[PDB]
Symmetry: C3
Subunit: 92 residues, 3 copies
């Protein structure tokens, strides 16, 4: 794919508050992470929030979790993050 | 992560009709499932539909499939569901 | 699930330019692929783009990558694609 032999990619799905999405996007950019943002809404409170999709090399997962924790995360705020396996990664 | 040693999380991606999204969200809440909703659109009919993202413990996958089937699912209606593996789950 | 014993599904997540989303949706339809579309936005340029979710049988992954490459993909344009494992696939 676009990944060198011997490494792996993960997919980060991070659900954060709308009021923090701006700060996270900027800090991901500063740190050379790529991201795609989704305007979403919560099942329980039924209010808008933001979901980021971040494809990242396995080697940098701790690093990106750290960024999410610093910029988002809690009485208020908070971030919910899933790390998911990726079979292949391509750019066309 | 946020998961006890010995268990695993799965990611449920459920594509349902807009007119059923309200009923599913309420029944997931009643049953202590967390969810994130995405306004989406179908590739074929090119009309709005709703996509839910639900992170759930492996032990409760049958339970949540049952909820989706009861609230959504078909001449009309219907639900399309993917169950996907999750490496880790965090809250910050 | 909805998958015959011995095969597997993959989840394709494809991020493409808005101006190409129409052409991809039509070519996926012609080729008997199902798809769900998400209006998204890029982390870096902060402009609208489109994310497709495509559940596909393992046997057809090369085929669908080929469609994405032909319709989207680059001085301009371009497509970013993740192939992800799927545990189960259901329709209700
Ligand atoms: N396992 C999971 N799978 C998929 N998406 C997830 C998820 N956990 C969280 N999300 C998303 O993160 C948002 C904030 O979750 P949080 O747990 O920090 O904060 C939650 C939580 O404190 C509480 N909450 C949610 N469901 C609850 C429940 N059944 N009982 C009591 N409190 C609940 O209300 C707040 C707002 O939740 P809301 O649904 O509106 O919005 C949630 C949801 O969109
Ligand atoms: N493998 C998959 N991967 C990713 N997303 C999936 C998917 N299967 C379904 N979805 C999503 O679920 C929606 C309803 O699918 P359903 O199969 O029940 O009902 C479908 C199906 O009955 C039919 N349909 C879709 N594609 C077809 C095709 N190539 N040939 C004949 N009928 C098709 O039109 C209805 C509307 O489909 P639409 O695309 O507008 O919207 C679809 C799509 O957004
Ligand atoms: N690993 C990944 N994980 C999750 N989503 C991904 C991703 N790679 C790309 N995407 C999505 O695809 C869109 C186009 O990416 P592309 O790499 O072809 O083209 C990129 C790339 O040429 C450049 N770019 C992005 N980040 C950069 C950075 N940190 N430094 C230099 N150039 C960057 O700006 C263009 C626009 O990127 P933008 O973020 O606005 O929008 C991106 C993003 O939404
Ligand atoms: Ca802010
Ligand atoms: Ca209804
Ligand atoms: Ca076009």
């Amino acid at each position: 794919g676009l990944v060198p032999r011997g490494s792996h990619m993960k997919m980060i799905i991070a659900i954060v508050q709308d009021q923090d999405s701006q700060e996270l996007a900027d800090q991901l950019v500063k740190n050379n992470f790529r991201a795609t943002k989704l305007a979403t809404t919560g099942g329980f409170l039924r209010a808008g929030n933001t979901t980021f999709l971040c494809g990242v090399n396995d080697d940098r997962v701790d690093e990106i979790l750290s960024v999410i924790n610093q910029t988002c995360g809690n009485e208020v705020g908070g971030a919910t993050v899933f790390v998911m396996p990726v079979d292949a990664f391509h750019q066309f």
